[PDB]
Amino acid sequence: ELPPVASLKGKSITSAEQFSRADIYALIHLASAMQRKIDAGEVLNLLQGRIMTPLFFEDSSRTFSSFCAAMIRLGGSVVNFKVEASSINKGETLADTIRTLDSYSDVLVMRHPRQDAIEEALSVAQHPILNAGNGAGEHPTQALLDTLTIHSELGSVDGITIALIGDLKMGRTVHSLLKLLVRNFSIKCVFLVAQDVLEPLQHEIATKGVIIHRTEVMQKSDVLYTTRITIDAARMRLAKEKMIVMHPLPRNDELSTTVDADPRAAYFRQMRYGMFMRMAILWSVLA
Amino acid sequence: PPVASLKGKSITSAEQFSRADIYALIHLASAMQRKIDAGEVLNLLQGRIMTPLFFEDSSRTFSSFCAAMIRLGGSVVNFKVGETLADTIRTLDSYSDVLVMRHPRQDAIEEALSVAQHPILNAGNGAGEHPTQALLDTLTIHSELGSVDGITIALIGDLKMGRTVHSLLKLLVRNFSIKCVFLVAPDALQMPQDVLEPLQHEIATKGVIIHRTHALTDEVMQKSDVLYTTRLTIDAARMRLAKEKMIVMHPLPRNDELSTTVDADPRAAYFRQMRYGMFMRMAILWSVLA
Amino acid sequence: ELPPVASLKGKSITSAEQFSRADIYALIHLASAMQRKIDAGEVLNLLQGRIMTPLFFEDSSRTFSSFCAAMIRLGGSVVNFKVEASSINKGETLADTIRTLDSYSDVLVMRHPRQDAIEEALSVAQHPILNAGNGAGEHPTQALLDTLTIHSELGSVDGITIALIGDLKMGRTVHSLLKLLVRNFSIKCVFLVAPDALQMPQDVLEPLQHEIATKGVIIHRTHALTDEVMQKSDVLYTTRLQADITIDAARMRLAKEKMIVMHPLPRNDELSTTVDADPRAAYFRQMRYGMFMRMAILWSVLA
């Protein structure tokens, strides 16, 4: 019914590159099985007596709350550790902070801007660590929920035309999304609406025959993915019938509130797919 | 049994409740009290999530709502408060079963309602209302005094900005036959007209007596079944004027207006009032999410 | 199983002085039994429906988190009151705050930088309060879990030689630990390692004087970690400044084979990371013992 993904058991998750196609599909179907059960109004006790602790050294609305609700809806609990009210103010090191939370918890959810910080944490923690985002563009559960969103709303990820839109120079998190999409699925076409990112993919781009075009988008795209070239109701008049608009959030003026009523606006539903994908992930790690 | 009338509703105003609704809530609160005090566990809302969305500070309101959800077997996702209020609401709405919102602007409850898919419980909208505070106040009166109709109540303090007294006056005038209401306040902090005017017809019809005073007269002390003071003096000296069968209430927090000298008086119901509050909110939350 | 320690039923915990040796061993053994159950994977429901509210007016990592984790693993719940986001900002007194959380809660866990704030709290609270640290006064539950650590790691507390190291003046953990050990056990020798400015206060040492004399406990002050201290001590218990008293790998060459290094934590440079791979390094394991001791305590208070 809710079979854990075996390959993730006990694994720390820090990068989307750690997943095969087969993991990605298994997580998608597990998250869908989670949605069915939860929207039926039924309880899960799968992680009763298990603790997640968040270590957020940066702010998060979405990701922090999503992670907590996921754990709770699996029947688990959350220790509300706050970095700003911690013994870090008395000089405690990052390594000592990890060992501390590791003495009480079953899983840690870490958000820290620096990649070598999550790495130092991995070298001292006995329990799994899940990366909730860093400045290197590693946000693996965002990449997976985005992919679940496309799959669920359109029926499939293979075959799609997708526009990536916004800060695609310094937006390291979408560079990861592209890589997951390109390595695991058969994308028809990418638009980059605005070197080191596309080069590692050139092979699969050629092998799989993925058409690329930097910048017409409105008419051809199955997915308009934007980040904080404005999308509004007027521009949506040119979009196709079966398509979606996505945004990891938060947004500024690049995505008008005039889109919010459009049934193709998928960026609020996107957050709820996030809860279910994170349920799929937590259960799989801790089963 | 959950109060059916509240099922899946948001709670924004004292005005939405019938007399039957209130008593149903009360009888439900009192059953919950008895089971909690007998050590009975209630697993009524397992796997439901409340998110408190507090843009102003709170000790009671925040904590009672969290405590009430927990005592119903429910859970709480804490959320620390650049992005719009509507976008924030949708975010919390994407994982919660119920939102508890307190916000300094009066009309923000209404804006949140306009984008929220799940029920929102108004926990203070500016100078407007505090609905669940009025329900728990009335539960306090019923439990401590044994009846609500026929009481003489003094509402003391800042009646102008006090959301609690706005809601409490509204709840008692519409659904009960109170005998007398003292409004005890200096002219500039008196109960506004936008609260009193709409109640005029009910006051007239039920023969409610309304007296305004600028200070806590001996008459007020000597005739009230309930002294409900609010923040911006009652002390043990003044409590010597109180009747034997009566209570002192205050929604809290207090400063000087309610002295610590009163605290040990059997009639000081304002601490028990917080606990009635927890049981009332259990009744509310269960009713909404049944 | 896991019968509660009856003597703690309904009791606030303010001081290491309030316990008997029987209470101490019962708590230690209960915590060990909790550890076996949790590590076997059992899901406890002993405190289903019960609430702890943390009330921390100072920073914390271990004490806050272990108490929350202890309550959870007992099947209990936590209300996350934040002092910074509270009605204390609108004029509310400590006493009214206590009465507020007391109206909803089964147990309060209180840390406050004022030494007598805990007495004020107890004066108005109907429900139990556990002292998680009162200024430079005490940290009673730390002393309990430290003693569980010693017992579990060494197998005995009577007859040990223990060095208390660092800032003994302001160190609330060593205040509680010294009182707990001296009153209830037959300690052979206590080394008090600290420069004169930071030595163990007389308001701790003087009350224990009779007991030390009757039990023949040897008390020896030093300024540094001398060869003697290193060679004789079964426990090295070191603290942070709230002197050559630093423990590192090279200093550990003088340590005996059967001994442990402890630190209540957080640490600064007084306890080098070069010690961390040493099997005698017990200060991480000490945190996990702390969670199990707080489970023993919370259960015994609330059963």
Side-chain angles (χ1 to χ4, degrees), chain A residues 2-10 12-81 83-137 139-167 171 173-177 180-182 184-187 189-191 194 196 200-201 203-210 212 214 216 218 221-228 230-234 236 238-240 243-287, chain B residues 1-39 41-79 82-108 111-116 118-177 179-186 188-192 194-196 198-199 201-210 213 215-239 241-242 246-255 257-290, chain C residues 1-81 83 85-89 91-208 210-240 243 245-303:
Chain A
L2 296 174
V5 181
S7 68
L8 284 85
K9 186 186 183 184
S12 286
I13 307 305
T14 56
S15 163
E17 298 176 26
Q18 289 156 207
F19 302 113
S20 64
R21 178 164 161 104
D23 305 320
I24 292 154
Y25 278 101
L27 287 168
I28 283 155
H29 293 118
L30 183 51
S32 296
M34 295 294 179
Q35 169 272 321
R36 287 262 187 240
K37 176 75 166 171
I38 295 302
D39 289 345
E42 295 171 1
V43 173
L44 291 167
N45 279 311
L46 295 172
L47 294 187
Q48 283 297 347
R50 320 290 296 268
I51 294 181
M52 159 203 302
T53 303
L55 286 81
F56 276 64
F57 292 73
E58 272 184 339
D59 296 328
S60 134
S61 183
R62 258 127 230 122
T63 300
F64 170 88
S65 301
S66 187
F67 262 112
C68 294
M71 191 66 182
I72 289 158
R73 290 185 183 284
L74 290 173
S77 312
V78 178
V79 168
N80 201 33
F81 175 81
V83 161
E84 62 275 18
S86 73
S87 287
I88 291 166
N89 304 334
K90 298 174 269 180
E92 188 154 32
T93 60
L94 167 67
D96 274 2
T97 300
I98 298 295
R99 296 175 176 111
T100 294
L101 294 165
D102 196 54
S103 314
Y104 316 128
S105 310
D106 294 273
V107 62
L108 308 173
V109 181
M110 185 167 165
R111 157 87 76 118
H112 192 293
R114 302 188 46 93
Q115 177 172 318
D116 59 15
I118 186 77
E119 294 177 341
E120 198 191 355
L122 297 170
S123 80
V124 299
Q126 305 292 353
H127 299 101
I129 300 176
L130 306 182
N131 177 15
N134 63 30
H139 199 337
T141 68
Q142 188 76 56
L144 293 159
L145 81 93
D146 292 352
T147 306
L148 169 61
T149 295
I150 293 160
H151 166 91
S152 296
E153 301 274 302
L154 301 188
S156 99
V157 186
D158 280 349
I160 68 171
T161 295
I162 181 153
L164 303 177
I165 309 161
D167 184 27
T173 299
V174 318
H175 303 160
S176 300
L177 184 59
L180 188 107
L181 295 184
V182 168
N184 295 293
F185 303 83
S186 283
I187 305 305
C189 174
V190 189
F191 296 105
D196 77 342
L201 315 177
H203 194 91
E204 295 215 56
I205 286 168
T207 297
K208 287 171 174 185
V210 183
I212 314 293
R214 293 177 166 81
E216 186 195 338
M218 298 302 152
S221 297
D222 310 297
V223 178
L224 293 180
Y225 192 95
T226 184
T227 57
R228 135 185 138 293
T230 290
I231 290 167
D232 61 13
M236 286 306 300
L238 298 164
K240 70 168 79 159
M243 64 79 68
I244 48 172
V245 184
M246 298 180 55
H247 192 322
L249 296 175
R251 54 163 171 183
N252 301 334
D253 55 340
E254 70 282 2
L255 178 54
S256 177
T257 54
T258 51
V259 182
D260 295 356
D262 199 310
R264 296 166 294 189
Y267 38 94
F268 308 124
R269 298 189 293 273
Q270 183 172 351
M271 290 186 284
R272 188 158 171 88
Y273 294 117
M275 187 184 70
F276 297 121
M277 168 59 68
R278 289 179 171 119
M279 284 175 80
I281 292 177
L282 287 171
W283 170 235
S284 298
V285 172
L286 298 175
Chain B
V3 181
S5 60
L6 265 69
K7 202 195 169 298
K9 275 90 182 158
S10 298
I11 289 151
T12 48
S13 160
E15 298 174 5
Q16 69 192 84
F17 304 103
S18 73
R19 178 186 182 91
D21 284 346
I22 295 161
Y23 272 122
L25 275 171
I26 279 168
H27 289 310
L28 178 54
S30 304
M32 269 166 189
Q33 179 257 318
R34 294 191 289 272
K35 278 157 162 230
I36 295 305
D37 296 339
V41 175
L42 306 172
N43 228 56
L44 295 174
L45 293 184
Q46 181 175 354
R48 308 296 166 244
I49 287 165
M50 174 210 285
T51 300
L53 180 66
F54 279 61
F55 291 83
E56 329 189 297
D57 301 316
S58 152
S59 293
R60 270 145 293 285
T61 304
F62 178 80
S63 295
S64 49
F65 271 120
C66 295
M69 189 80 180
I70 287 160
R71 293 186 180 284
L72 293 168
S75 313
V76 171
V77 162
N78 294 105
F79 164 91
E83 184 167 42
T84 65
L85 169 68
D87 277 5
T88 298
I89 290 308
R90 292 163 172 134
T91 298
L92 277 20
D93 213 22
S94 74
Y95 64 81
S96 312
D97 295 280
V98 62
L99 312 188
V100 180
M101 188 174 145
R102 161 174 286 193
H103 198 279
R105 292 195 297 112
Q106 203 160 298
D107 55 8
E111 185 197 340
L113 285 172
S114 80
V115 310
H118 295 101
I120 296 179
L121 313 188
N122 181 7
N125 62 309
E129 289 206 43
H130 204 339
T132 68
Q133 184 85 47
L135 295 171
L136 78 88
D137 297 349
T138 306
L139 165 63
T140 292
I141 299 161
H142 164 89
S143 297
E144 296 278 313
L145 298 187
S147 70
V148 177
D149 289 351
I151 68 160
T152 299
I153 186 156
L155 311 171
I156 309 152
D158 185 353
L159 306 172
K160 187 181 183 176
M161 311 300 258
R163 28 177 186 238
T164 67
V165 295
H166 304 171
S167 281
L168 188 51
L169 186 64
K170 282 176 180 188
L171 201 82
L172 299 175
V173 171
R174 282 165 64 86
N175 308 275
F176 297 94
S177 296
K179 159 170 140 154
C180 181
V181 176
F182 302 108
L183 305 168
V184 181
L189 299 186
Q190 262 299 340
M191 181 76 67
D194 70 0
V195 173
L196 293 167
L199 297 176
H201 181 65
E202 284 255 18
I203 281 158
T205 311
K206 299 170 156 172
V208 180
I209 293 155
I210 300 289
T213 71
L216 180 55
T217 63
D218 283 6
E219 171 173 27
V220 176
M221 294 304 302
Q222 289 160 324
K223 291 184 178 168
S224 302
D225 301 299
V226 176
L227 302 172
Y228 186 99
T229 179
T230 57
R231 191 183 73 110
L232 195 57
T233 296
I234 315 152
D235 58 23
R238 205 162 276 171
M239 277 310 308
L241 307 173
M246 71 82 72
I247 56 173
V248 182
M249 296 177 61
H250 191 319
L252 294 171
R254 64 167 157 188
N255 302 350
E257 74 285 349
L258 178 49
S259 155
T260 55
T261 58
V262 183
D263 292 357
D265 195 299
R267 296 164 293 187
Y270 37 97
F271 300 135
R272 285 189 297 280
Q273 195 173 341
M274 294 187 275
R275 200 167 167 83
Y276 287 125
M278 180 183 84
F279 298 127
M280 179 45 62
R281 292 174 166 131
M282 294 183 61
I284 289 171
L285 282 164
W286 169 226
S287 293
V288 172
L289 298 177
Chain C
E1 31 156 305
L2 280 99
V5 185
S7 74
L8 279 81
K9 182 160 167 64
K11 295 222 182 149
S12 294
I13 306 282
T14 51
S15 169
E17 300 175 356
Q18 79 191 68
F19 304 107
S20 68
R21 169 187 182 106
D23 295 327
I24 300 162
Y25 272 106
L27 284 171
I28 283 175
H29 290 324
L30 178 54
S32 296
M34 296 289 191
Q35 167 267 309
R36 293 177 84 75
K37 285 168 109 76
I38 296 302
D39 283 348
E42 292 168 39
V43 180
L44 305 187
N45 290 319
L46 304 174
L47 296 179
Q48 190 180 355
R50 320 285 299 278
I51 293 176
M52 165 222 280
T53 300
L55 185 66
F56 281 61
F57 292 85
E58 316 183 295
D59 292 332
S60 169
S61 284
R62 266 141 300 273
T63 304
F64 174 85
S65 297
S66 63
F67 264 120
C68 293
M71 189 65 185
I72 286 159
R73 294 187 176 278
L74 288 171
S77 296
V78 187
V79 166
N80 297 283
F81 188 73
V83 174
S86 63
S87 290
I88 298 185
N89 293 342
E92 193 155 34
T93 58
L94 180 57
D96 285 359
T97 303
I98 293 309
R99 298 168 172 281
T100 304
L101 283 52
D102 192 59
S103 315
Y104 315 126
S105 297
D106 297 278
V107 58
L108 309 176
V109 181
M110 184 175 166
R111 171 169 285 190
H112 195 287
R114 259 185 41 244
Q115 189 157 331
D116 62 9
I118 199 77
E119 307 168 39
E120 288 164 37
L122 281 169
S123 77
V124 313
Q126 294 276 66
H127 304 111
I129 302 196
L130 312 183
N131 180 15
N134 63 320
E138 291 217 39
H139 200 337
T141 69
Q142 186 75 41
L144 290 162
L145 82 88
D146 294 340
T147 304
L148 165 62
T149 301
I150 296 168
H151 175 77
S152 316
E153 294 273 325
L154 298 184
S156 190
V157 190
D158 289 340
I160 65 184
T161 298
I162 184 164
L164 308 184
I165 308 157
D167 183 355
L168 313 186
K169 183 182 182 161
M170 308 299 293
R172 58 189 169 203
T173 77
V174 299
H175 303 162
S176 288
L177 191 58
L178 185 57
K179 293 168 167 173
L180 192 80
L181 291 181
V182 168
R183 286 160 63 90
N184 304 300
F185 297 93
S186 302
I187 303 289
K188 186 194 174 162
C189 176
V190 185
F191 295 112
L192 300 174
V193 184
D196 288 11
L198 305 184
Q199 265 293 344
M200 188 68 72
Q202 287 308 308
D203 86 348
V204 180
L205 291 176
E206 275 165 25
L208 300 171
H210 199 189
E211 200 104 38
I212 294 165
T214 302
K215 296 190 176 178
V217 187
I218 291 162
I219 302 291
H220 181 66
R221 300 169 293 163
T222 66
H223 303 160
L225 284 172
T226 66
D227 294 5
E228 187 194 26
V229 172
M230 291 302 313
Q231 292 166 353
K232 290 170 178 181
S233 292
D234 304 296
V235 177
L236 296 179
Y237 187 98
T238 194
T239 56
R240 192 177 72 94
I245 49 139
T246 295
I247 300 164
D248 56 22
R251 178 103 70 201
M252 287 296 295
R253 296 169 76 197
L254 298 166
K256 73 175 75 187
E257 185 185 345
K258 191 196 211 292
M259 64 81 70
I260 54 168
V261 183
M262 295 177 63
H263 198 315
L265 299 180
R267 60 168 167 183
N268 298 164
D269 301 344
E270 75 288 351
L271 179 55
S272 179
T273 54
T274 57
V275 183
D276 300 352
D278 192 325
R280 303 163 290 190
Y283 37 96
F284 303 128
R285 293 194 287 283
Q286 180 180 355
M287 290 186 281
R288 197 165 165 80
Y289 286 128
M291 178 174 75
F292 298 124
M293 173 53 73
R294 286 159 172 144
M295 289 181 66
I297 289 168
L298 285 169
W299 172 229
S300 293
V301 171
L302 293 177

